[PDB]
Amino acid sequence: MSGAGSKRKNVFIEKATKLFTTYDKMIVAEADFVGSSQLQKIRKSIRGIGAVLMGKKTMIRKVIRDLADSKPELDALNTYLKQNTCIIFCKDNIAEVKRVINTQRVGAPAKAGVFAPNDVIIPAGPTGMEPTQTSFLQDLKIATKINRGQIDIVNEVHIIKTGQKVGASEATLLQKLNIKPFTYGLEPKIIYDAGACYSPSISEE
Amino acid sequence: MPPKVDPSEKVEVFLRVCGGEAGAMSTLAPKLGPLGVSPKKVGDDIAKATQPWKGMKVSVKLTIQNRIAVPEVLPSASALVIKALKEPPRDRKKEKNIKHNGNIPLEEICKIAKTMRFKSLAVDFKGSVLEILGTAHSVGCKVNGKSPRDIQAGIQSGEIEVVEPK
Amino acid sequence: IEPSLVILARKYKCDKMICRKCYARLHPRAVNCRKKKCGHSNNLRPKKKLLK
Amino acid sequence: CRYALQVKPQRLMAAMYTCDIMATGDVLGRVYAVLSKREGRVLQEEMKEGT
RNA sequence: GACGGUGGCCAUGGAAGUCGGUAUCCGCUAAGGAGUGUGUAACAACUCACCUGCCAAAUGGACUAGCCCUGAAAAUGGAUGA
């Protein structure tokens, strides 16, 4: 084929001329690796402050929308764009913009080849019984899955916790588990006012 | 709607439509055979309770379990709320019969039900509902300015109001 | 275990497509006979499973 | 009488019975597939909690 | 990444895009057909259209027409004359 993704462009020309950069605060956010199903529910105060906007073909064309403002073109001698990264325009204060996305956040399920931190409890419900499942749970510390009047092969409380994070060893034991609600929020690429740039943050500073 | 009573003794949520008044169907294991853990419906006339004058036909139901209890809950669906206001002839004895009939105003009743469908999409519950409902059905036109699933009306190509509440 | 193996077996058995001329099996995403007896038909049908 | 009723449209009253089959849900889908080929129609597919 | 309304209305009283009939719309988005198959009781799950991350300069296609090949099988041992 021959095009852009796999078809020629007629709406990505409009992403540069989508708005004027009237808003004084922007931030590069990594909300693409988290899924679109959960991404639309957390964003209610996230849109109305400037919205989640702009394409990633036009992220290089973004430079003509910084010359209008007092902002320099690059953020801190680098645009910081080597990832699925989108711009979120904000009207919230200099301290509030540091935690604008993390105020309402949620993660996606853990994939093959990565563990990810699991802070929230795992779901429950009737899923039969399996004796071979107990042999795989011997690697883990808790070897008990049947709880209460119901019967099932996974617990109602998270056994996978922070501290057990690794590259690729205990990640195979999560494929034995039948459900993956791995919460680690969303990820700031950088924080930025209108001239000065900062590192990713969760606090007011 | 959200659940009326929260599932206790581990969460239990099951999904079969249970359409119409008639029938003694209940959901405990739609992916497996009949039994889940134990026999517990509860009640055969739950369908009737859920769908008295909301439909005889493709009428959705969020079946749950509170360890041997069901409090009757429906999703406030895009089909169920519009068909509630419709006349009893098209809500009764249409179980083995097609229905593509209903062009009366349903403007007021869907506004309150818009929060129950979704609670966070960054849109107006009385403004964006005139686009999302009304011009997305063949059994519900609302005002006759709109067109049933077309590109003639509902997106302001004939309408003048579209994001504003009527 | 078994089912995974079965899939693998299929991949080296069923998946390959054939030419309506030889009935000679090329591969599961093919566009041609790549044989000179056929005359290079490029008019392939997939191999029919035990389901069908 | 025969003549009178011949010229009129004579709709087929087929002799049918409902099949109270009792199986598992896993293979009933498959069982039903073949039933469809014998000019059959489902009136109600449901689950018996108790048996 | 591949969504919300949504399990679209129907048939169903299971067919929840995908045994299947007809309409096939709107939101929101970087993008996402009321859905391309695989799969499943139908779903779920997976993939496709659709988009984007990286790599980094060419790519795609429908035809025409030279030579070649396929089409192009038969009777002593054999013929660009060798």
From Swiss-Prot, chain A:
<dbReference type="GO" id="GO:0005811">
    <property type="term" value="C:lipid droplet"/>
</dbReference>
<keyword id="KW-0687">Ribonucleoprotein</keyword>
<dbReference type="GO" id="GO:0031012">
    <property type="term" value="C:extracellular matrix"/>
</dbReference>
<comment type="subunit">
    <text>P0 forms a pentameric complex by interaction with dimers of P1 and P2.</text>
</comment>
<dbReference type="GO" id="GO:0070180">
    <property type="term" value="F:large ribosomal subunit rRNA binding"/>
</dbReference>
<comment type="similarity">
    <text>Belongs to the universal ribosomal protein uL10 family.</text>
</comment>
<dbReference type="GO" id="GO:0002181">
    <property type="term" value="P:cytoplasmic translation"/>
</dbReference>
<dbReference type="GO" id="GO:0045335">
    <property type="term" value="C:phagocytic vesicle"/>
</dbReference>
<protein>
    <recommendedName>
        <fullName>Large ribosomal subunit protein uL10</fullName>
    </recommendedName>
</protein>
<comment type="function">
    <text>Ribosomal protein P0 is the functional equivalent of E.coli protein L10.</text>
</comment>
<dbReference type="GO" id="GO:0022625">
    <property type="term" value="C:cytosolic large ribosomal subunit"/>
</dbReference>
<dbReference type="GO" id="GO:0042254">
    <property type="term" value="P:ribosome biogenesis"/>
</dbReference>
Curated annotation (Swiss-Prot), chain B:
<dbReference type="Pfam" id="PF00298">
    <property type="entry name" value="Ribosomal_L11"/>
</dbReference>
<keyword id="KW-0689">Ribosomal protein</keyword>
<dbReference type="InterPro" id="IPR000911">
    <property type="entry name" value="Ribosomal_uL11"/>
</dbReference>
<dbReference type="Pfam" id="PF03946">
    <property type="entry name" value="Ribosomal_L11_N"/>
</dbReference>
<protein>
    <recommendedName>
        <fullName>Large ribosomal subunit protein uL11</fullName>
    </recommendedName>
</protein>
<dbReference type="GO" id="GO:0003735">
    <property type="term" value="F:structural constituent of ribosome"/>
</dbReference>
<dbReference type="GO" id="GO:0070180">
    <property type="term" value="F:large ribosomal subunit rRNA binding"/>
</dbReference>
<dbReference type="InterPro" id="IPR036796">
    <property type="entry name" value="Ribosomal_uL11_N_sf"/>
</dbReference>
<dbReference type="InterPro" id="IPR020783">
    <property type="entry name" value="Ribosomal_uL11_C"/>
</dbReference>
<dbReference type="InterPro" id="IPR036769">
    <property type="entry name" value="Ribosomal_uL11_C_sf"/>
</dbReference>
<dbReference type="InterPro" id="IPR020784">
    <property type="entry name" value="Ribosomal_uL11_N"/>
</dbReference>
<dbReference type="GO" id="GO:0022625">
    <property type="term" value="C:cytosolic large ribosomal subunit"/>
</dbReference>
UniProtKB/Swiss-Prot annotation, chain C:
<comment type="subunit">
    <text>Part of the 60S ribosomal subunit.</text>
</comment>
<comment type="function">
    <text>Component of the 60S subunit of the ribosome.</text>
</comment>
<protein>
    <recommendedName>
        <fullName>Large ribosomal subunit protein eL40</fullName>
    </recommendedName>
</protein>
Swiss-Prot record, chain D:
<protein>
    <recommendedName>
        <fullName>Elongation factor-like GTPase 1</fullName>
    </recommendedName>
</protein>
<comment type="function">
    <text>GTPase involved in the biogenesis of the 60S ribosomal subunit and translational activation of ribosomes. Together with SBDS, triggers the GTP-dependent release of EIF6 from 60S pre-ribosomes in the cytoplasm, thereby activating ribosomes for translation competence by allowing 80S ribosome assembly and facilitating EIF6 recycling to the nucleus, where it is required for 60S rRNA processing and nuclear export.</text>
</comment>
<comment type="similarity">
    <text>Belongs to the TRAFAC class translation factor GTPase superfamily. Classic translation factor GTPase family.</text>
</comment>
<comment type="subunit">
    <text>Associates with the 60S ribosomal subunit. Found in a complex consisting of the 60S ribosomal subunit, SBDS and EFL1. Interacts with SBDS and binds to GTP and GDP; the interaction with SBDS decreases EFL1 affinity for GDP and facilitates GDP release.</text>
</comment>
